[PDB]
Amino acid sequence: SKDFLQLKGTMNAFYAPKQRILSILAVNRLFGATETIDFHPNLLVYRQSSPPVRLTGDVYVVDKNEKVFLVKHVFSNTVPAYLLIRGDYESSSDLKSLRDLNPWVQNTLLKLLIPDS
Amino acid sequence: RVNRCIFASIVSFDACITYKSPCSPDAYHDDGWFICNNHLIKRFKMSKMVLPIFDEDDNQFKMTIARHLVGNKERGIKRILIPSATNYQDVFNLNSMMQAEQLIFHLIYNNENAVNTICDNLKYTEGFTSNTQRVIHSVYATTKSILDTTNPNTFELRFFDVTNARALRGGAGDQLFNNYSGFLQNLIRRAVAPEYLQIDTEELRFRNCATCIIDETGLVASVPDGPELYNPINRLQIRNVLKFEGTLSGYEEYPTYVPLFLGYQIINSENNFLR
Amino acid sequence: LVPVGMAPRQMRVNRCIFASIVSFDACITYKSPCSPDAYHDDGWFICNNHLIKRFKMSKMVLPIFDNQFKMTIARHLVGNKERGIKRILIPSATNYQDVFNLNSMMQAEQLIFHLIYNNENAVNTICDNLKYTEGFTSNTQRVIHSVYATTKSILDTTNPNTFCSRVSRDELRFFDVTNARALRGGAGDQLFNNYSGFLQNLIRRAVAPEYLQIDTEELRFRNCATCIIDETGLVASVPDGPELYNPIRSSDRELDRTLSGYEEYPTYVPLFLGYQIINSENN
Amino acid sequence: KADTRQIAAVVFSTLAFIHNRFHPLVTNFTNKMEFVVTETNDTSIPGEPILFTENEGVLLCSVDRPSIVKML
Numbered sequence: 001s002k003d004f005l006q007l008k009g010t011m012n013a014f015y016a017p018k019q020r021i022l023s024i025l026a027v028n029r030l031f032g033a034t035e036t037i038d039f040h041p042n043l044l045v046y047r048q049s050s051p052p053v054r055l056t057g058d059v060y061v062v063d064k065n066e067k068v069f070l071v072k073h074v075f076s077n078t079v080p081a082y083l084l085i086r087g088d089y090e091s092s093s094d095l096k097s098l099r100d101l102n103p104w105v106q107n108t109l110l111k112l113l114i115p116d117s
Numbered sequence: 118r119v120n121r122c123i124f125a126s127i128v129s130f131d132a133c134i135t136y137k138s139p140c141s142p143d144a145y146h147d148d149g150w151f152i153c154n155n156h157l158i159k160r161f162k163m164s165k166m167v168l169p170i171f172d173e174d175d176n177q178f179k180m181t182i183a184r185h186l187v188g189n190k191e192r193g194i195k196r197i198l199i200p201s202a203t204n205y206q207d208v209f210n211l212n213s214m215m216q217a218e219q220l221i222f223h224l225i226y227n228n229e230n231a232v233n234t235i236c237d238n239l240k241y242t243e244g245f246t247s248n249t250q251r252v253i254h255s256v257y258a259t260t261k262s263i264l265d266t267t268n269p270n271t272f273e274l275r276f277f278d279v280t281n282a283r284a285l286r287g288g289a290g291d292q293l294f295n296n297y298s299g300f301l302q303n304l305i306r307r308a309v310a311p312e313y314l315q316i317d318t319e320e321l322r323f324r325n326c327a328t329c330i331i332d333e334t335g336l337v338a339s340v341p342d343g344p345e346l347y348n349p350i351n352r353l354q355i356r357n358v359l360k361f362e363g364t365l366s367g368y369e370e371y372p373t374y375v376p377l378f379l380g381y382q383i384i385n386s387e388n389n390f391l392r
Numbered sequence: 393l394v395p396v397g398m399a400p401r402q403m404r405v406n407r408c409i410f411a412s413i414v415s416f417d418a419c420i421t422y423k424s425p426c427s428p429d430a431y432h433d434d435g436w437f438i439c440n441n442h443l444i445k446r447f448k449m450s451k452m453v454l455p456i457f458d459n460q461f462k463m464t465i466a467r468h469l470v471g472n473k474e475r476g477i478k479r480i481l482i483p484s485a486t487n488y489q490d491v492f493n494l495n496s497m498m499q500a501e502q503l504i505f506h507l508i509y510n511n512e513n514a515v516n517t518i519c520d521n522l523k524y525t526e527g528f529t530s531n532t533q534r535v536i537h538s539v540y541a542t543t544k545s546i547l548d549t550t551n552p553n554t555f556c557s558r559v560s561r562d563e564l565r566f567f568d569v570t571n572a573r574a575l576r577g578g579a580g581d582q583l584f585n586n587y588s589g590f591l592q593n594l595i596r597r598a599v600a601p602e603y604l605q606i607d608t609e610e611l612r613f614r615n616c617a618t619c620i621i622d623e624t625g626l627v628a629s630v631p632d633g634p635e636l637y638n639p640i641r642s643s644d645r646e647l648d649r650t651l652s653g654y655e656e657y658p659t660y661v662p663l664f665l666g667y668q669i670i671n672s673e674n675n
Numbered sequence: 676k677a678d679t680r681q682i683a684a685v686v687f688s689t690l691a692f693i694h695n696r697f698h699p700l701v702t703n704f705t706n707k708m709e710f711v712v713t714e715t716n717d718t719s720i721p722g723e724p725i726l727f728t729e730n731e732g733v734l735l736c737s738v739d740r741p742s743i744v745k746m747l
């Protein structure tokens with residue numbers, strides 16, 4: 001939909017500007033994208049919060065130094081996915097290793113994170 | 118300005134080593150303590166405190182008391198506060214502390230063999246006779262003077278194991294207290310508050326249950342039974358920048374402390390003795 | 393930020409292991425004494441100060457040649473009258489714990505020794521004790537990890553090259569008494585093998601060989617051995633009899649009228665022991 | 676433009692560095708400081724990309740990030 005744009009080089013990753021959200025479909029492909037946007041760190045705007053914003057469910061650490069996390073999220077219409085967030089966050093439960101994630105999301109994350117030097 | 122800061126009479130006899138001695142000012146207080154607050158905290162996990170008893174007009178009985186610095190998860194050695202002479206060497210990592218501090222501890226526990234061993238080892242320091250022996254003399258004399266001062270036998274009805282309901286039999290915590298040195302006994306008296314205070318047939322109860330435990334291992338910040346008491350505790354950075362400029366706040370707070378409450382103090386016909 | 397992403401910078405590096413000694417008690421500031429030599433990128437991984445303090449050894453150079461090659465060499469600081477344990481120039485893994493007074497020195501240096509000497513049990517004991525001693529989490533843990541990482545980095549730099557040298561064909565060294573008709577030499581090579589890789593490198597850098605065969609030419613620096621190796625380790629002892637007089641003129645009128653500016657032979661006792669062989673120069 | 680945090684950090688660090696360069700004994704700035712990043716000409720003042728104004732309780736530093744970007 002027009003609410004977001006598919007990230008270049010990804011079949012299951014998109015970004016919603018008005019929401020400032022990067023999302024990765026758990027098991028689903030994107031389709032119909034006539035446009036794509038190059039990934040860039042600015043997209044992961046650091047969320048400011050005097051007390052760390054609490055998070056629930058499955059949480060994974062991407063960059064502890066940069067307060068980057070991956071949060072399991074299901075769209076109310078029951079669409080599984082993960083949200084990549086950067087900011088002052090804390091986890092209600094124990095943080096989980098990324099290896100737990102499926103190869104699909106893992107490949108997308110590698111593409112999005114490792115700079116193409 | 119007598120500095121009673123035992124464990125600050127430590128001199129880094131090694132030239133390459135400099136002892137900061139960053140310890141608490143209260144050592145210059147002519148109190149019943151022979152060890153000031155920071156030494157107490159560091160080496161016994163205790164924080165000095167005072168417990169007023171009668172504070173109405175001028176009767177100002179202010180019994181002293183220290184606080185646990187032990188959480189509700191530590192156990193065994195981690196929980197022991199004042200180890201016995203049989204286990205203090207193990208509880209304290211003497212090897213990790215300066216030999217002068219080790220000497221102080223050995224004197225406190227009457228480990229003369231360890232004292233002799235330490236001075237024998239110091240015998241083989243490069244500047245041994247020049248200044249190592251002078252340091253030995255200074256530290257040893259200071260510690261011995263403090264110990265003699267503490268010891269009452271030199272030139273009252275406080276029972277520490279007599280509070281423990283549900284104990285099978287025996288007490289003997291007072292036995293070990295007797296076995297302790299004068300300095301250790303005075304420290305225990307100064308820091309531990311008897312749960313009961315009887316004056317001329319007048320009993321005051323401060324707690325419904327004692328907080329400390331005394332056994333062969335020594336003084337332990339353990340409970341008489343059940344689980345342990347809950348005991349919680351610029352270089353401008355990017356994170357230090359705060360965001361946009363923009364719940365019982367109105368009520369006072371009861372401390373989440375665990376003061377040393379254990380024992381029964383009996384006072385004879387003597388009245389409210391305030392000297 | 394200024395620097396390129398990562399881009400490991402290039403600078404000098406203090407090389408003596410003991411430079412990393414620091415008081416685990418953060419409230420106690422300490423500075424270890426390091427000789428400036430530590431900042432020379434050479435085979436020595438110990439500074440002159442630590443070397444003299446702990447091993448009783450002083451560095452030295454031996455010119456070799458047309459092209460003047462400089463071979464590293466250490467020398468005795470052991471006096472003539474020293475006896476027994478005092479004669480242990482470098483203790484073995486079975487005696488260092490005793491020769492070095494672990495109790496009298498800092499915990500960090502004790503860990504350094506238990507790392508150099510392959511004493512994993514002692515290293516683990518120290519690590520666990522520090523885990524359960526003082527404010528380990530706050531900064532003591534990070535300091536300990538830094539010291540351990542530095543020591544392990546030095547050891548990982550040294551040991552691979554040491555093993556390659558051991559199995560090397562072109563370069564061969566034999567730490568024993570070249571006078572095979574002697575009893576104080578023994579299985580010096582076996583003892584050297586017993587030593588750790590980094591310790592073996594130190595021994596190589598310190599003890600020069602009595603002879604040196606380069607290709608077809610042999611140079612005999614001594615008609616005798618100035619030190620030996622036994623189970624105790626490197627011993628500053630004369631293999632054949634009376635100890636060599638070591639005046640120790642420094643550190644720890646007609647005669648001069650005649651002896652004005654006048655070439656003087658040093659009284660030092662360098663380390664000469666064993667046989668060394670090399671093909672080509674490799675220099 | 677999004678990461679105002681870093682802009683404010685850099686500006687304050689520079690200001691404190693200059694302040695210390697004038698008063699070497701000073702390593703902080705005492706009173707807390709506010710920061711705002713203008714984004715329009717009608718919000719910016721020519722010739723003074725960085726300026727100050729108190730809210731009657733504490734000083735606020737105004738930054739013309741577009742002008743800074745243009746210069747650099």
Ligand SMILES: [Zn+2]
Pocket residue numbers: 408410411425426427430438439440441442
């Ligand atoms: Zn050094």
